[PDB]
């Protein structure tokens, strides 16, 4: 499942660097150039979403009270509910990833960095395994980069 | 103080329309040309700010615990703090007016409509009485309309 592996690599890398505050120079292994531009786009757009909704996100995280690995399945349930109206678009997708990055920052703060990888896999699972055909029709991460292109 | 009267009229009308949910056709009285387009712009931009920050605003309103007329002056204190870095721009101003409308909606919900006018006056007081020179340099509400032109 190349699409899952590529997607996990991008989302995992973004959540990791957000939680640590450091952009890893390690090259993308399973993303093939398109992933590099996607991560670059996700940094710009994902960071802006977090700045726009930081206080809202804090309240959501508090209500969810995610403290360990078995709580990540609540973010999975939330994402399923988001898409339950049958609508899919990149704004929704990148808002969920950005909330994921916000949660990862919190997990690192409370010495729960081990939960960041399972969090990323949970997010990628919903995206790729329930929205596969839509992603493929958008040409995957290339469509993501094009959609958020800055003039 | 024409600038105060013009500004109060715009902000008062917007807060009241939001609280009741009904766009009044009553013409603006002391706002001239800029006033008509300003309320139109404030409706578009202000409604979008509230959509963008509804949940954050709800939490803010909860922490402030505004229940009656004495509590209304806390928004003016919040506005003073917002501008304490010496920076002024229309995004800040409209975000504060939009939160004011969000509060006005709440006041109506708890049968405190009498507090909406004092809230509008407190907002207008901070804007006009502490940022007068900046407003005049921006060409007042005409600059507001141009800045947010679509």
């Amino acid at each position: 499942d190349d699409l899952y592996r590529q997607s996990l690599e991008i989302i995992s890398r973004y959540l990791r660097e957000q939680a640590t505050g450091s952009k890893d120079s390690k090259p993308l292994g399973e993303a093939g150039a398109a992933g590099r531009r996607a991560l670059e786009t996700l940094r710009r757009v994902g960071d802006g979403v977090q700045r726009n909704h930081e206080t809202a996100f804090q309240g959501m995280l508090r209500k969810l009270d995610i403290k360990n690995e078995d709580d990540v399945k609540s973010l999975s349930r939330v994402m399923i509910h988001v898409f339950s109206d049958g609508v899919t678009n990149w704004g929704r997708i990148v808002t969920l990833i950005s909330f994921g990055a916000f949660v990862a920052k919190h997990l690192k703060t409370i010495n729960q960095e081990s939960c960041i990888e399972p969090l990323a896999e949970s997010i990628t699972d919903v995206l790729v395994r329930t929205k596969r055909d839509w992603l493929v029709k958008q040409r995957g991460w290339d469509g993501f980069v094009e959609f958020f292109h800055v003039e | 103080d024409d600038l105060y009267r013009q500004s109060l009229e715009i902000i008062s009308r917007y807060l009241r329309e939001q609280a009741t949910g009904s766009k009044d056709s009553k013409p603006l009285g002391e706002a001239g040309a800029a006033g008509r387009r300003a309320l139109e712009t404030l409706r578009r931009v202000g409604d979008g700010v509230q959509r963008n920050h509804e949940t954050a605003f709800q939490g803010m309103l909860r922490k402030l615990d505004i229940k009656n007329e004495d509590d209304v002056k806390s928004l003016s204190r919040v506005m003073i703090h917002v501008f304490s870095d010496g920076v002024t721009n229309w995004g800040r101003i409209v975000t504060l007016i939009s939160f004011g409308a969000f509060v006005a909606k709440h006041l109506k919900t708890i049968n405190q409509e009498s507090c909406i006018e004092p809230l509008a006056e407190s907002i207008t007081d901070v804007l006009v009485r502490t940022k007068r020179d900046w407003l005049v340099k921006q060409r007042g509400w005409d600059g507001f309309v141009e800045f947010f032109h679509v």
Binding site: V49, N52, H53, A56, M60, K63, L64, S74, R77, V78, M79, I80, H81, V82, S84, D85, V87, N89, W90, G91, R92, I93, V94, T95, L96, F99, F147, F148 | G48, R51, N52, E54, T55
Partner: peptide, 23 residues
């Protein structure tokens, strides 16, 4: 559930954000 309410908030935010790039 709190999860359903949080989802509605994230969906709304997502759609507002999508619209600034779609046009």
């Amino acid at each position: 559930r709190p999860e359903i309410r949080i989802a509605q908030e994230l969906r709304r935010x997502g759609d507002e954000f999508n619209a600034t790039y779609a046009r």
